[PDB]
Ligand binder design. Structure first.
Ligand SMILES: CCOC(=O)c1ccc(OCCCC2CCN(c3ccc(C)nn3)CC2)cc1
Ligand SMILES: CCOC(=O)c1ccc(OCCCC2CCN(c3ccc(C)nn3)CC2)cc1
Ligand SMILES: *C(=O)CCCCCCCCCCCCC
Ligand SMILES: *C(=O)CCCCCCCCCCCCC
Lengths: 5, 266, 62, 283, 266, 283, 62, 5
């Protein structure tokens, strides 16, 4: 999915 | 790593002094300044303690050392009476106590000669100008403020019995008080010997027969500077070098606040 | 493929970290916006380029 | 790990001092700057610092679109004896002064580049006729490729060159360009020549300009109005805005203090006295 | 045990420098010289690395500092082009890279005064003498070799449009390049202040937008020496003291060997 | 935890009373307002309250774009002896009255700001010619930066200043600005001066305006038509709408009751009698 | 990185909480819309700033 | 993913 930080 | 007896930095409040040519520094009677302890306290009211506003380096007017110079003197706290918020705090309260860092400044060159004796004297009572009456120096003449006074090589009595000069006549070899200058070394002191050092630095505790007193009526310390060895340079018959005096109040506190004292100083 | 980062929030509403989302649309990274997540370094190489390390309390020349 | 937007160091409380430590005393001859903070020379209180150097990061300093050139093109009546004006610009940050001075705080740089094009048009003749909406062609011609000689010659075919077709009145055109240098970094200064004069060889043959590397570093932009000649003449201007993104810089330099005079570091007579009168003892 | 910031010994190849009056030494941008790494390499041929034959101390012609002196400049590698096996290696190869130890020498006496600013400038492009044309300084005039060039206190434009002088006109307060000298301190530097030190020592890395380049077409570093404080002595109205410049190539390597380059240097 | 849109307190049923408790009796001298609710003085029924104070929250009260200024610019014929008009506006909420009065219910405020620009144009001459679509440049010039003296001078390059390039006929332009104050909050009132008159120093030298802090608080907006002079003159207006978002306010104040007269609190003669006639015993 | 919140629903259709989705597109929080999820406080500091706490059933002056 | 509330 989507890699935050 | 490089550190030395000769190279010092002093910092109090917004002021810093540096010196590259010191001869260590003296703490009078081995006692660093301190605030008044509860066990030795006497006025019961909450003291005023100005801290950085008053405990900082005030620089007084520069004097000039020449082959004619017999010597200079100042009294504390009197010399600081007109200095910033210290003086203001002093004149608004009945009682006050204070310690001091005295830093005497006098540089010259590898080809000049001379030695200044810098003495910090507890209760430095000086002798007056009269041989007809005694203990008669006026408050105005006893307290020069910042400007200080000088020593004379000769006692010359005030003859005007009708309008007395009412001042001190401090003879240098008698330390202006009837005792011989060569023994003044039992007082906390340093020597500015021009081949060795720029300056003198003395840290003075509050000294008194009382824990706190009237600063306006009473001086605790006297700073006396006398030429132990006369100024000399190369071959010039009348040389001159400046002596600048910088003093800092320390651990000072005040009691008995009221309206401001306005002294008759003239 | 979404990248989620924190905003350093200045003047907070009268309304916990606040975030913002980023997605790259192009194959070439030159097409990308500026991240603005930059680093800082110490000025040493410009301010202190001397061979022997300096101690500020010590004499510079000894 | 120190981020550009982290808060700066807190001020620590510091008291009186009487010691052999000398922070105030130093020797600038060494080449170093004395790293002092207020507590080294004055009595300080404790302050929790919140300020940050976020906006003075290299990205942030250059994160703005700067005008680097104004190109002029037109589309005249079929009749007028003079040729239809298409524009040719050699790409550079040096035709204008502001971005140039900012980039010149540094000797070398490396960055991706964003170009944004603001296009405006107007009528020139006291006339009265009209023009239908113009489409502009912005063609990049890289060093080596055929430069256009006519508004309508074969080169505008662009089979391999990158062109933008801009429609008047739409949002301003924009493209991104990679780091295109034949060097590991762009040289803002080149203390040298592109040619060695050889003894044996003739003087005129070995000569070249000082500080100039490739005669044509990055090629040209060629712009035209694609529309055919219209009875009423319209003139148009293309303003080019350049922004250095994803930038890195090396070797700091003093800023330009006197007016720029050409592509090099040369200064001109009469412009050399920037500083004004102020007396030593006057606040 | 005795060791000090002021007393240094440097040794490279068959040469040794001693100094008893240094003010430490500078490593430009914190980077010591190094040979080209495989990960950053570009020409594929086996490099020539002369080591002790070229990486040693070459002493250039002594210049003279006087009350009239506005300043001196040199370019690297140009100043070393005629120096022993370094110059030979430089002119036989298309490509070359090199770092440098620059040691500026200038002693005087406890009674002299003055301060020299020694600046190492990456890509030191200087301004020309013309106001009618730009970027026109000839290769011969841009490259003085060992002898270097000087700074002027006044910009004086070349008027001869028919036979142009084609040289630099470097105005001192503008660092010869349109920027103010007071900011030249952002460049790697040292100051020879005569009361403090004999010399300046700067260690320079190879700096460039490329890993290796044409040394004959391009200078990487400029050495600029300007009097920040004018020379003065005792009372003599026209004093003089020498400034000797000794430079050593470091970690230098060369690529693209062919026949020797014979440049038109006049 | 009480949200702005939570329902207000329910009314509770309350019966008859005969006691020593005196809610109705009080003393306003204390400085307090008596916290009474209907059940303290009348018999009440039980009501389940549904109303909320959502729309009177500080955000909601200010959550609207308000007109703070109208800037006028033009683009004349090349021929006309008079200069092409570009506009310069000093940024402030005080040139208009409505938003000013709302913000002035409070002494201090803190907010992010949204600016929206509505641009309109028209023909001025009885003439008959035309103009092609105009692009406008709105440049922010912060205190210190070079203010433009000409529609086309070097300052419009904007290498570092924030500019908007607006295309006529497109949706109105919009930007957001952070809290930019050099203070912890914006001061709507400053009871003081920016200068101390010193005895020793001359009277004229120590003088300054009352209630004014920085002579130039936030800089100026400079607007121009980027298009070149067109034979038919077009005049244009830029309306600036300001909305305070992410707002916080401190120290409440009475609203302005008499007409504003300038940037300060000054009132003018003849405008001081707001209230109208109504008799004490007339409903 | 999406933020999902509840709508306080007024006039319900002739059709359980209803939601709305929000995503921040910009790094600077000043660019953000207004959340409108604000708080309320009690008027006490303005309406009752007296040093001694007040009991409404009691005499204000005693 | 996406933080609700
Ligand atoms: C000496 C001048 O300034 C510079 O050093 C300098 C200036 C600019 C710079 O960018 C290099 C040019 C890259 C080109 C390559 C691609 N470009 C394009 C490509 C397509 C289109 C339609 N329009 N422009 C235009 C820019 C890099 C360095
Ligand atoms: C005394 C006047 O009113 C105020 O107190 C007051 C008024 C305004 C206010 O905002 C401060 C101004 C910030 C500026 C900063 C950025 N601005 C920009 C930036 C870019 C562009 C294209 N256009 N405008 C314009 C607004 C803050 C306080
Ligand atoms: C990682 O990105 C997975 C989640 C994707 C969410 C929707 C992205 C929005 C549409 C992007 C289209 C592609 C851009 C060319
Ligand atoms: C958190 O946000 C992960 C889910 C992302 C869903 C798609 C977002 C829609 C595209 C946003 C692009 C970035 C805005 C600059």
């Amino acid at each position: 999915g989507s890699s935050s930080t | 790593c490089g550190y030395s007896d000769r190279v010092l930095q002093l910092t109090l409040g917004n002021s810093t002094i540096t010196t590259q040519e010191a001869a260590n520094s003296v703490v009078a009677y081995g006692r660093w300044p301190e605030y008044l302890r509860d066990s030795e306290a006497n006025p019961v009211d909450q003291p005023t303690e100005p801290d950085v506003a008053a405990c900082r380096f005030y620089t007084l007017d520069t004097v000039s050392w020449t082959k004619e110079s017999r010597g200079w003197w100042w009294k504390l706290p009197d010399a600081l009476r007109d200095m910033g918020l210290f003086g203001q705090n002093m004149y608004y309260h009945y009682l006050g106590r204070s310690g001091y860092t005295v830093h005497v400044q006098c540089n010259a060159s590898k080809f000049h000669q001379g030695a200044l004796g810098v003495f910090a004297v507890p209760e430095m009572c000086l002798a007056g100008d009269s041989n007809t009456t005694t203990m008669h120096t006026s408050y105005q003449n006893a307290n020069p403020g910042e400007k200080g006074g000088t020593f004379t090589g000769t006692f010359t009595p005030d003859n005007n019995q009708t309008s007395p000069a009412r001042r001190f006549c401090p003879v240098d070899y008698l330390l202006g008080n009837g005792t011989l200058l060569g023994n003044a070394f039992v007082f906390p002191h340093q020597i500015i010997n021009l081949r060795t050092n720029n300056c003198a630095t003395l840290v003075l505790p509050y000294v008194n027969s009382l824990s706190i007193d009237s600063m306006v009526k009473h001086n605790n310390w006297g700073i006396a500077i006398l030429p132990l060895a006369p100024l000399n340079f190369a071959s010039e018959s009348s040389p001159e070098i400046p002596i600048t005096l910088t003093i800092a109040p320390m651990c000072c506190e005040f009691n008995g606040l009221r309206n401001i004292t306005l002294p008759r100083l003239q | 493929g979404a990248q989620v980062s924190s905003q350093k929030v200045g003047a907070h509403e009268n309304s916990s970290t606040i975030n913002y989302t980023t997605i790259n649309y192009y194959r070439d990274s030159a097409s990308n916006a500026a991240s603005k997540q930059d680093f800082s370094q110490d000025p040493s190489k410009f301010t202190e380029p001397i061979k022997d390390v300096l101690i500020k309390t010590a004499p510079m020349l000894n | 790990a120190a981020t550009s937007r982290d808060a700066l160091p807190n001020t620590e409380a510091s008291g009186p001092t009487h010691s052999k430590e000398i922070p105030a005393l130093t020797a600038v001859e060494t080449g170093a700057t004395n790293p002092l903070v207020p507590s080294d020379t004055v009595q300080t209180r404790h302050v929790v610092q919140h300020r940050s150097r976020s906006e003075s990061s290299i990205e942030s300093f250059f994160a703005r679109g700067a005008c680097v050139t104004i190109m002029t093109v037109d589309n005249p009546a079929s009749t007028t004896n003079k040729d239809k004006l298409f524009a040719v610009w050699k790409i550079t940050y040096k035709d204008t002064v502001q971005l140039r001075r900012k980039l010149e705080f540094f000797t070398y740089s490396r960055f991706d580049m964003e170009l944004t094009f603001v296009v405006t048009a107007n009528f020139t003749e006291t006339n009265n006729g009209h023009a239908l909406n113009q489409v502009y062609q912005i063609m990049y011609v890289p060093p080596g490729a055929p430069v256009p000689e006519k508004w309508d010659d074969y080169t505008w075919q662009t089979s391999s060159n990158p062109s933008i077709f801009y429609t008047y009145g739409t949002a301003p055109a924009r493209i991104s360009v990679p780091y295109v240098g034949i060097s590991n970094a762009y040289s803002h200064f080149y203390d040298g020549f592109s040619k060695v004069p050889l003894k044996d060889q003739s003087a005129a043959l070995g000569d070249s300009l000082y500080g100039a590397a490739s005669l044509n570093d990055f090629g040209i932009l060629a712009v035209r109005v694609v529309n055919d000649h219209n009875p009423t003449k319209v003139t148009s201007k293309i303003r080019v805005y350049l922004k250095p993104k994803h930038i890195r810089v090396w070797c700091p330099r003093p800023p330009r203090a006197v007016a720029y005079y050409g592509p090099g570091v040369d200064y001109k007579d009469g412009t050399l006295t920037p500083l004004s009168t102020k007396d030593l003892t006057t606040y």
